[PDB]
Amino acid sequence: SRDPASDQMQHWKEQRAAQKADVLTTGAGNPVGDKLNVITVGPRGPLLVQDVVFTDEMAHFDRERIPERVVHAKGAGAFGYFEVTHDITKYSKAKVFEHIGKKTPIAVRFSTVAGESGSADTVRDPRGFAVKFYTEDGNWDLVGNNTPIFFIRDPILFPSFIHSQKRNPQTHLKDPDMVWDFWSLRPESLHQVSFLFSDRGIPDGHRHMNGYGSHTFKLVNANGEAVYCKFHYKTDQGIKNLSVEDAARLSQEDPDYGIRDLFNAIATGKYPSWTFYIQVMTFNQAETFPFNPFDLTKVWPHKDYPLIPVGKLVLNRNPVNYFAEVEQIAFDPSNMPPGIEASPDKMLQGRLFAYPDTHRHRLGPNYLHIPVNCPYRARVANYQRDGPMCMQDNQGGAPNYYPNSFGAPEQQPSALEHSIQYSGEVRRFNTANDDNVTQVRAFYVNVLNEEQRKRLCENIAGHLKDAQIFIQKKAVKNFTEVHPDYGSHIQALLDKYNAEKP
Amino acid sequence: SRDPASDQMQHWKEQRAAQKADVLTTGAGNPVGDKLNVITVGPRGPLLVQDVVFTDEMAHFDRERIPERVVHAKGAGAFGYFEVTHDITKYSKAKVFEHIGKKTPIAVRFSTVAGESGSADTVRDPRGFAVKFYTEDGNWDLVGNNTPIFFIRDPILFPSFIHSQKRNPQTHLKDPDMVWDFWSLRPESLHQVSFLFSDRGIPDGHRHMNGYGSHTFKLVNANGEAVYCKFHYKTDQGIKNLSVEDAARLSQEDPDYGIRDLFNAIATGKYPSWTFYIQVMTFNQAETFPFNPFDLTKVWPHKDYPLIPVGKLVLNRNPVNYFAEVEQIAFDPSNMPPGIEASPDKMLQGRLFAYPDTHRHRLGPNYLHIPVNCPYRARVANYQRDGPMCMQDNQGGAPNYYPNSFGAPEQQPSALEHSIQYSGEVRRFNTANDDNVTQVRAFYVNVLNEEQRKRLCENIAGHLKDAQIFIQKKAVKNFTEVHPDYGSHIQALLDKYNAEKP
Amino acid sequence: SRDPASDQMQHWKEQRAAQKADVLTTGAGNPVGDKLNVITVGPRGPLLVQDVVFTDEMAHFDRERIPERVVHAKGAGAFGYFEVTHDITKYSKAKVFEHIGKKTPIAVRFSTVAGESGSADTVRDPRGFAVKFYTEDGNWDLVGNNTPIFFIRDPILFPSFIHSQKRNPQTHLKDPDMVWDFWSLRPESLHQVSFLFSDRGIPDGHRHMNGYGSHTFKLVNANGEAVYCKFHYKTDQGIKNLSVEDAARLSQEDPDYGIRDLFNAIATGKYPSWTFYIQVMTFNQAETFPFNPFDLTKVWPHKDYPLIPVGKLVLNRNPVNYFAEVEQIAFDPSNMPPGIEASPDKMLQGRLFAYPDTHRHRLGPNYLHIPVNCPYRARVANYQRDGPMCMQDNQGGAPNYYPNSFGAPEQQPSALEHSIQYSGEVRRFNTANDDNVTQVRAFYVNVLNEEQRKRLCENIAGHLKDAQIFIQKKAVKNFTEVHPDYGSHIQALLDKYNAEKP
Amino acid sequence: SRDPASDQMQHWKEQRAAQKADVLTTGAGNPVGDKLNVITVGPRGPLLVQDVVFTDEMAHFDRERIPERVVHAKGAGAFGYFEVTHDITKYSKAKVFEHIGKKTPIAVRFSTVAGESGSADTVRDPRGFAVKFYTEDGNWDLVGNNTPIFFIRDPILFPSFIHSQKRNPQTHLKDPDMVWDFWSLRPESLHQVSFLFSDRGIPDGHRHMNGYGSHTFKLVNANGEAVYCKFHYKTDQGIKNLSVEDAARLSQEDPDYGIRDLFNAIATGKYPSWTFYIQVMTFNQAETFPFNPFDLTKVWPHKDYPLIPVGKLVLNRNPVNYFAEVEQIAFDPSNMPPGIEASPDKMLQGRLFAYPDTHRHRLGPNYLHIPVNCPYRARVANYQRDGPMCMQDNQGGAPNYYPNSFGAPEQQPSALEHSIQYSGEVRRFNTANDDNVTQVRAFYVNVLNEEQRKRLCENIAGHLKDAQIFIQKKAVKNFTEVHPDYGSHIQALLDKYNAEKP
């Protein structure tokens, strides 16, 4: 007997036990006489079109692949639940938080950002940590990262950032000129680059990392009073990281290290959990916060904004079929039940558009009817009809226009959004030159010890050495602005690497 | 109170009765506060992206349309059952025919050929009569016409024939030059052109027409003995046709006459039925038949091949949602359970390829999981996986390769096809100059009376008058070959029409 | 010799003249030996898969259809040019208007709203009049109607409105209960319903109707000063309408009357033109306008806002292939060159999202590379890459991220949009009960004469008679509010029709 | 200065030189004022829908990914030419071979089989070597492997084989139980498994490997006389292989080793070439060949069937954009000009169906209009029309039906295929138990030396150790049948590995 992942098929055979083999059928349920040989004109003659068994099977095989996710392509999934452990009903009317001990089913997908489908798990990258909550007020998708921040603060740059992080358009190779030209020109990236190149850039599987909502959200209570919040989900298995050397070894030996680790943990009963916290900031505190509190390159310091415990995420179930439950899952940040709303974080606003949009491409217009995406603890009743691969009854003969005088679904006034006044011109405002160094300096100095600063600078120099000198110089300039020692230590290591380079 | 079709919504309201209106939700089940107004910056300001209710709804609306069927676009559907009334188990082992009184659920779609989605029902055209039988040996699709024959005997010409029957590629108009140039050059069309331009070219709705399989099929019994057959399903409501004048009036007043007539009949309990017959021909009779018995331009005369009664089709149920059940239905002639097989009819062989192929385009690779297409009285178990819009469980964790040593589905030797030896070179054989007049002459002379011959010639001349003279001459030449009176009477009427034309 | 439309193929043959027939090829350019017969095992044997000529052709035929447009499905197209005839450079910096005599190529598509692909042209409906201007500042799409107004003033209701105007979801029939329930509940529709049921509801082909932008747009001049405007394009062939009786006759005799009329006019040199006008309103006038000047249910009265002449549209070219140039054309109201901008018309704002969104579905992500959609008088240079059916060079090896230090395209500050301040809360504002009768009354009383009022009431009653009584009563109530005579005359005719109804 | 691949962007900048930066535009060519910041209601307010620059860019980014190839996903491409160096016109009338010195442009894609898009190049796998020849008789696609044989001899098993070679459906991991269960049950795999696990299983980049057509093809000369042939294209850079240890190191250090190696070779002028040979067998020799000569698990021994030189493939051009030219390229084995035909190799027959079928999914129905797929040295003239993303003119107003009397393209009798008679029943014939060991034994004994046999057995045992014991036993049984030493040496190493396993 091996690890549970290696025994997948043996275990499936054993559950079947004395049951006779099912009859092998075509797509349309017609029994198949022989699926080992094709129909031919005698033993050395050509193939006949009336071999429809062959064509049915081959045509399906031809269309097995769907587009990979534009980002976060390489993933591992699991199911379990969220349990409420404290009352936060003062902050939010959301039914997910309604009373202590209320259990909500969840789906999670862990992912890297830049690697395509086949790529190694144990590489330096931000990790996605997406959580779908199947609530009675429909699904809530909290589509998180393993970092509280991101590289950019304006959503128009996200395609550019991803292009720089992927392959050269001509050579189809990873290109450090591209990666570091983009970062050196966008120094709002310094904060997330510092975290990325620290130890937690390569977690030891998905079980040993935190997740964050990263954005500011707005919570609204039953009285219509609003606060801003951050979501944090801190690992109960404890933070653990791979060394660069072990990460490299695993990249070759086990490209799917993350998938295997998580599948095995759940199959052997070692159920990974995370404690779900909020930080809360009031609307008055948001006016007086030294930075933009909706700036995705900034954290809220813990002293001023302590973590308020809410609940626990537990993963206790493996996906039965990976394609059905993990390839096809779709998380939309716009799927927010009443009591949770978008802040004016520019980056979050961009994400409200982008995700349904890509889901309709990658999966299809009716992707929300795919069972993993279905809000199966709500009744969906609306005026949407038709579209390819329309499943169930398409809401039967119900009137398909609103308003109507025929008792078809009605809007629910309690579900109406929180109202705010905003001051200023409707125009494009420049954020680039915000305050991109202050909190990065706090991280370098007050969070990292001396050993960690040394590895941070060795990890940066090891990547940045492959850029052209003019890029290296602009990169080092930005690191210098964070802290003289940060810049100088990077420059020192680059001088060594550029001298060894013939 | 009006006809049942006009009272669709009132009846739906009444069934709901005292029930409170459902809550109006987004696609993801989140309740909607207000779906009458969009979120704006003050009363005369611009629209916000965080209006996701608006974007969810609009984006769905944008993708409501799917490709129309390449042919047979305009359709009406119904459900009911097939009941066996006689034993034909001597001819076929098919479970659909297994014992007297065995009921099988059916789905039917009636259609014209050339009209696009919006077009009028009451036009001169062949009518489709497609029947899906949901058997325990999977679905059987008998994809029939309202005529026993077709215009062509080789499947390579089918796209050409349809192009000639549709719109000019530049003008986007119906083009009689195109229609009649194609027919005048392909005189195998004479038989189906004669039927088309007779009275039964415009049936009085779908209830007053026969359906035919048209092709020769091969029936195989439990001993492995094969016969050839034709399927006929003769209307129990009796044949009835619209006059050209009434057809024209209805085309303007009620473009959806066929849909309305059938929906109303079923809603008022007047359940239309058809008696299902076979003609049988043995393999020896097929050797000695004066024509090719697999020639789709030929009938089997009733004296030599009498109709053997089998069962009854009854339509007793309206579709609940037209898009779900009629737009999305897909019939594949290749879906044949054991005991029914393809003959070597060249046209049928072509159809075994074409239909799954177009279904994967029009609907999607997993179109057989759409509930109307699902073989819900069989267990589907196979090695097909994934593909966009994968529904249910994708067969769970079952081994996905065959052969395997893990008890995954097994081929069933009893379902193996009937074996035949064929003599000759593998090459392209010319059929054009077969015997394209003999059975047409039998129809003109022995089936039609004098009144019917006169209308046939008036109906042809009325269409053919719009072709160029050289086309008219080649058309009349082919009609002359059927019978001198056929050609002469057409020429006479054309001379009148061409003189009135300035 | 017939009309030019009827002689399409003869003319094509004649242009070819002495040229030998091209060689018939597969999709991949391989010459075809015989495309009249399929490869079979002897003359009465089955079809072989190695007949790839057959499968290549059939598979293409299977995928000929694309989704029809969700609205405006049935269309006729033409090409020509726009010529500037007056200086409006004081109002707009747009290069389309740059100097007198400047010619810009155009594409136009005329359409009904509700009819599907096959449907009759000569029916009562609003007509689309879409104009694509191929300018040197890229394409400008002015996607107009044959009416200055529309039925609704908030874009969230557009899917609902279209559903009510199309087929019942169960019966698949047109449903007057649906049509009039929606209008009776949304009395902002009264203005467009009055125009629709007047004489200009059924124009005599596309040449005898006006087009309007309908929305308020914002013009910006080279000094950065903004005005609001309306676009009007008035027919130079003069307004002409079909009677209800002639419309009905043509619906049966010539379903494609509009397509034929326009194709023939252009082929015989009778080039239809429209005079292109603007109305201008200043930002101060917009503050003091008695209604919302961005309300799509309102006109700007001509006395207060006179038509300023700008140029002339001339259509002088037929599409060479209808599918290439008319089915595949895509117009995006968001395609506005510098100097033309969106107003805060809520309906226009909705349209900025919806059209690219549906185009990516109907045509594909790279639909702007389809030659009719290509901005062929601009160089397209951007950071967009890949996507299915990527044509040309995908911008070669150019850096694909922005900002970059490698001389890839740069933003152009002169193209930056006009800035405005807006006052108010970000919330959903109710518009329903605006002023929905005042301008309708002006139309009924001051524009229509007595004969026209009588036909208006006969046309309404003739449609509305088929609704249930409670709907009829709410409809008449809203007409009464416009004018007592309007309501009373409709009620009188309904009493007659409801008495004749058994 | 680095390798040319690393200097891609610097070289692109330098070619541009003094040229001013292009203007950054939308998709529709409208100039962009600012693409660094989004439009917001004041500096901390929400995002507006009228930011169409943002939505245009984001929506495109959302749809960048297309489905990866179902097999051979990970690829490197290049262009160059084929030159004829000897006369083979006695064997084939194909215009590619027409006279000595005739140059034909080519496109090549090298690939692994099982790895997805992101995966490492330097892994043990068969390599694809696909060649598209752009001839004047259209494109010829010779879609080859780096081995003369394959694992299976019947095309119905190809989906099963690929499933076993890819990821477990539940765990999404590579599964040795799956790999070796399939091979141990299908011992026709022994020949290709022996080659795969020898040294040439991991070539040193794409330049140091042979390509083979693998199938028997049929050549037809101008007199209509047919022979059978194999195509071989032997590397002129010489065979060179990576050790298992170096392959593992490169898999981690340079996942894209193959892409980089080939791009650099071509950019530095070191143009890789292959000598193109045929083996010829006459129809009489095919009757007397000891095996099935159309059996894809068999070679033709070189003594009996010597290599006849034909020409040279030279690769001298890098793709300008990888997505345009390598992701979107499509090779169809069915694209054969006159003079080259399919043999009755069952596996080739299957491939005639599968490839166009998958191309229409992965790329689109009009994928042959993508410039890399376009047969640009032939005029394509046919009756195919429409389909999504129809480019060029859709063949203008040419008649779209055949036959016609309007001078539209005509079939070319010289292009008609070679005719053969075949003897036997049309049924499913069992091939499994053919002669699966004889030629494998010849390879083990006569081709491999002692060192190579030892590595072969170490390479097999190193993979097969991870299977369950019952699979290991059935695998070893099949290896024993090839040669007692083959089986015994594998069993010995497995006993060592299974003892170390706790």
| Alpha-carbon span B493 to B478, nearest angstrom | 16
Q: Which of C135, C96, C106, C149 is nearest to C272 (CA)?
A: C106
DSSP annotation of B447: I
Q: Taking CB atoms and an 8 Å limit, are D321 and C381 in contact across chains?
A: no
Scan residues 284-323 of D and list those with Cβ closer than 8 Å to C: 320-321, 323
CATH of C66-149+201-374, one of 2.60.120.920, 2.60.120.10, 2.40.180.10, 3.40.50.1370: 2.40.180.10
| Alpha-carbon span D137 to D97, nearest angstrom | 11
Per the listing, tokens 């190779």 go with: A173
How many angstroms separate the Cα of D193 from the Cα of each of B400, D348, D435, D458? 21, 20, 15, 13
How many angstroms separate the Cα of C93 from the Cα of each of C90, C221, C278? 8, 5, 15
Task: Please say whether the beta carbons of A147 and A212 come within 8 A.
Answer: yes
Task: Please say whether the beta carbons of A104 and A135 come within 8 A.
Answer: yes
Task: Please say whether the beta carbons of C456 and C194 come within 8 A.
Answer: yes
Q: Give the DSSP letter string of A144-159.
A: EESSS--S-SSGGGHH
| Alpha-carbon span C476 to C484, nearest angstrom | 10
Q: Taking CB atoms and an 8 Å limit, are B160 and D402 in contact across chains?
A: yes
Scan residues 1-60 of B and list those with Cβ closer than 8 Å to D: 41, 46-51
Sign of CA dihedral D119, D122, D125, D130: positive
Task: Please say whether the beta carbons of D266 and D189 come within 8 A.
Answer: no
DSSP strands (E only) in C318-386: 340-342
Interface test with C, best of B153, B162, B341, B428 (most C CBs within 10 A): B428
**Can you say which residues of C are annotated as belonging to the binding site for NADP(+)?**
191, 198, 200, 210, 234, 300, 302-303
| Alpha-carbon span B271 to B262, nearest angstrom | 9
Going by C-beta distance under 8 Å and a sequence separation of 6 or more, which residues neighbour residue D68? Answer: A65, A68, A117, D116, D117
Task: Please say whether the beta carbons of B443 and B195 come within 8 A.
Answer: yes
How many of the other CB atoms lie within 10 Å of CB of B370? Answer: 22
DSSP annotation of D233: E
Q: Taking CB atoms and an 8 Å limit, are B173 and C35 in contact across chains?
A: no
Q: Which of C272, C248, C206, C5 is nearest to C122 (CA)?
A: C248
| Alpha-carbon span A375 to A395, nearest angstrom | 15
DSSP annotation of A325: I
> Across the beta sheet with B420-421, what order do the strands follow?
A39-41, D425-428, B420-421
Helix, strand or coil for residue B164? helix
Strand partners, B48: D48
How long a stretch of residues is chain A?
Answer: 502
Helices (DSSP H) in A279-362: which residue ranges? 283-288, 322, 346-362
Strand partners, C235: C274
* B112 φψ region: left (φ > 0), alpha (ψ -120 to 50), beta (else): beta
| Alpha-carbon span D198 to D209, nearest angstrom | 13
| Alpha-carbon span A81 to A104, nearest angstrom | 5
Strand partners, B427: C40
Check for a shared fold between D1-65 and D66-149+201-374: no
Helix, strand or coil for residue A194? helix
| Alpha-carbon span A431 to C154, nearest angstrom | 33
Strand partners, C144: C129
What does the domain layout of chain B look like in residue ranges?
Answer: 1-65, 66-149+201-374, 150-200+436-500
- Chains contacting chain A through 3 or more C-beta pairs under 8 A: B, C, D
| Alpha-carbon span C499 to A161, nearest angstrom | 71
Task: Please say whether the beta carbons of D221 and D91 come within 8 A.
Answer: yes
Task: Please say whether the beta carbons of C359 and D338 come within 8 A.
Answer: no
Flag whether residue D403 sits within 8 Å of chain B, measured between CB atoms: yes
Going by C-beta distance under 8 Å and a sequence separation of 6 or more, which residues neighbour residue D192? Answer: D126, D147, D149, D150, D151, D297
Scan residues 329-368 of A and list those with Cβ closer than 8 Å to C: 357, 360-361, 365
How many angstroms separate the Cα of B296 from the Cα of each of B141, B182, C54, C427? 18, 18, 18, 66
Write the CATH number of the domain with boundaries D150-200+436-500: 1.20.1370.60
Helices (DSSP H) in A114-256: which residue ranges? 158-165, 176-185, 190-197, 244-253
Rounded to 5 degrees, φ, ψ at A171 are: -85, -25
- Measured at the CA of A72, the angle between CA A71 and CA A74, to 5 degrees, comes to 125
Cα end-to-end distance, chain C, whole Å: 52
How many angstroms separate the Cα of B2 from the Cα of each of B9, B253, C181, C469? 12, 17, 17, 12
Flag whether residue A388 sits within 8 Å of chain D, measured between CB atoms: no
How long a stretch of residues is chain B?
Answer: 502
Rounded to 5 degrees, φ, ψ at B411 are: -60, 150
DSSP annotation of D143: E
| Alpha-carbon span D436 to D440, nearest angstrom | 7
Going by C-beta distance under 8 Å and a sequence separation of 6 or more, which residues neighbour residue D289? Answer: D281, D300
Flag whether residue D387 sits within 8 Å of chain B, measured between CB atoms: no
Q: Which residues of C touch A396 (CB under 8 A)?
A: 170
Flag whether residue A244 sits within 8 Å of chain D, measured between CB atoms: no
Please tell me the experimental approach by which this structure was elucidated: cryo-EM
B72 is catalytic: yes
Strand partners, D107: D79, D132
| Alpha-carbon span A303 to C325, nearest angstrom | 64
Strand partners, B308: B278
Per the listing, tokens 């329930």 go with: C181
| Alpha-carbon span C268 to C262, nearest angstrom | 10
Token representation of residue C14: 């004649």
Q: How do beta strands D273-281 and C39-41 pair?
A: unpaired
Rg, chain A, Cα only: 26
Please, what's the largest Cα pairwise distance for chain B? Answer: 86
Q: Which of A469, A112, A48, A60 is nearest to A259 (CA)?
A: A112
**Can you say which residues of C are annotated as belonging to the binding site?**
191, 198, 200, 210, 234, 300, 302-303, 355
Q: Which of C137, C143, C130, C144 is nearest to C102 (CA)?
A: C137
Rg, chain D, Cα only: 26
Q: What is the 3-state secondary structure (H, E, C) of D28-66?
A: CCCECCCCCCCEEECCCCCEECCCHHHHHHHHHHHCCCC
Task: Please say whether the beta carbons of D354 and D333 come within 8 A.
Answer: no
Q: How do beta strands D39-41 and B75-84 pair?
A: unpaired
What residue type is D68 in one-letter code?
A: E
Rounded to 5 degrees, φ, ψ at C267 are: -70, -30
| Alpha-carbon span A82 to A315, nearest angstrom | 9
**Can you say which residues of B are annotated as belonging to the binding site for heme?**
355
- Cα atoms found within 13 Å of the Cα of residue A35, Cβ hemisphere only: 28
Token representation of residue D415: 């292009």
Q: Taking CB atoms and an 8 Å limit, are C412 and D60 in contact across chains?
A: no
How many angstroms separate the Cα of B241 from the Cα of each of B123, B266, B315, C217? 11, 20, 21, 56
**How close, in Å, is residue B135 to chain A by CA atoms?**
9
| Alpha-carbon span C376 to C139, nearest angstrom | 9
| Alpha-carbon span C493 to C490, nearest angstrom | 5
Helices (DSSP H) in D118-271: which residue ranges? 158-165, 176-185, 190-197, 244-253, 257-267
Q: Give the distance from CA D500 to its chain's centroid.
A: 39
DSSP annotation of A429: P
Task: Please say whether the beta carbons of A190 and A436 come within 8 A.
Answer: yes
Going by C-beta distance under 8 Å and a sequence separation of 6 or more, which residues neighbour residue B330? Answer: B355, B359, B362, B363, B367, B368, B370, B373
What residue type is C254 in one-letter code?
A: D
Q: Give the distance from CA D218 to its chain's centroid.
A: 20
What residue type is A194 in one-letter code?
A: S
Token representation of residue D236: 């002129």
Strand partners, D31: D25
Rounded to 5 degrees, φ, ψ at C189 are: -65, -15
Rg, chain B, Cα only: 26
Q: Give the DSSP letter string of B306-318.
A: PPEEEEEEEEEE-
Going by C-beta distance under 8 Å and a sequence separation of 6 or more, which residues neighbour residue C144? Answer: C128, C129, C130, C131, C211, C212, C213, C214, C231, C233
Token representation of residue B419: 């074996």
Q: Give the DSSP letter string of C445-499.
A: IIIS-HHHHHHHHHHHHHHHTTS-HHHHHHHHHHHHHH-HHHHHHHHHHHHHHHH
Q: Least CB-CB distance to D342: which of C16, C50, C414?
A: C50
Task: Please say whether the beta carbons of C315 and C108 come within 8 A.
Answer: yes
Q: Least CB-CB distance to C29: which of D19, D138, D323?
A: D138
Interface test with D, best of A3, A15, A50, A170 (most D CBs within 10 A): A170
* C45 φψ region: left (φ > 0), alpha (ψ -120 to 50), beta (else): beta
Token representation of residue A386: 């038709």
User: Please, what's the b/e burial string for D161-182 (b: 16 or more CB within 10 A of its CB; e: otherwise)?
Assistant: bbbbbbbbbbbbbbbbbbbbbb
Per the listing, tokens 């480019």 go with: D391
Going by C-beta distance under 8 Å and a sequence separation of 6 or more, which residues neighbour residue C433? Answer: none
Task: Please say whether the beta carbons of B30 and A380 come within 8 A.
Answer: no
What residue type is C20 in one-letter code?
A: K
How long a stretch of residues is chain D?
Answer: 502
Q: Which CATH class is domain C1-65?
A: few secondary structures
Going by C-beta distance under 8 Å and a sequence separation of 6 or more, which residues neighbour residue A462? Answer: A244, A493, A497
Helices (DSSP H) in B63-209: which residue ranges? 158-165, 176-185, 190-197
Q: Which of D299, D358, A136, B38 is nearest to C429 (CA)?
A: B38
How many angstroms separate the Cα of C267 from the Cα of each of B438, C270, C275, C312? 45, 8, 21, 20
Helix, strand or coil for residue B36? coil
What residue type is C460 in one-letter code?
A: I
Q: Which of A115, C463, C368, A320 is nearest to D116 (CA)?
A: A115
Task: Please say whether the beta carbons of D388 and D365 come within 8 A.
Answer: yes
Q: Which residues of B touch C47 (CB under 8 A)?
A: 155, 346, 349-350
Q: Which of C246, C218, C244 is nearest to C231 (CA)?
A: C218
Flag whether residue B101 sits within 8 Å of chain A, measured between CB atoms: no
How many angstroms separate the Cα of B66 from the Cα of each of A388, A390, C329, D381? 6, 11, 18, 29
Task: Please say whether the beta carbons of B425 and D420 come within 8 A.
Answer: yes
| Alpha-carbon span B158 to D316, nearest angstrom | 45
| Alpha-carbon span C390 to D327, nearest angstrom | 10
Rg, chain C, Cα only: 26
Token representation of residue C213: 């932008």
Token representation of residue A264: 């095995």
Cα end-to-end distance, chain B, whole Å: 52
Task: Please say whether the beta carbons of C382 and D27 come within 8 A.
Answer: yes
**How close, in Å, is residue A83 to chain B by CA atoms?**
20
Sign of CA dihedral B226, B227, B231, B236: negative
- Measured at the CA of B66, the angle between CA B64 and CA B69, to 5 degrees, comes to 145
Q: Which of C217, C213, C221 is nearest to C95 (CA)?
A: C221
Helix, strand or coil for residue D275? strand
> Across the beta sheet with D420-421, what order do the strands follow?
C39-41, B425-428, D420-421
Flag whether residue B119 sits within 8 Å of chain C, measured between CB atoms: yes
Q: Give the DSSP letter string of C410-437.
A: B--GGGPPPPEE--SEEEEPP-TTS--S
| Alpha-carbon span C282 to B411, nearest angstrom | 79
| Alpha-carbon span B217 to C305, nearest angstrom | 74
Q: Is the peptide bond before D403 cis (omega within 30 degrees of 0)?
A: yes
Q: Which of B61, B131, A295 is nearest to C70 (CA)?
A: B61
Rounded to 5 degrees, φ, ψ at A431 are: -110, -25
Per the listing, tokens 């029947």 go with: B131
Sign of CA dihedral C312, C318, C320, C321: positive
Q: Which of B204, B259, B264, B211 is nearest to B235 (CA)?
A: B211
Q: Which of C470, C481, C482, C483 is nearest to C494 (CA)?
A: C470
**How close, in Å, is residue B319 to chain C by CA atoms?**
7
SS3 content of chain B, % helix, strand, coil (to 5): 35, 20, 45
DSSP strands (E only) in D262-357: 273-281, 308-317, 340-342
How many of the other CB atoms lie within 10 Å of CB of D499? Answer: 8
| Alpha-carbon span B231 to B356, nearest angstrom | 22
Cα end-to-end distance, chain D, whole Å: 52
Rounded to 5 degrees, φ, ψ at D391 are: -110, 180
Interface test with B, best of C60, C122, C288, C428 (most B CBs within 10 A): C428
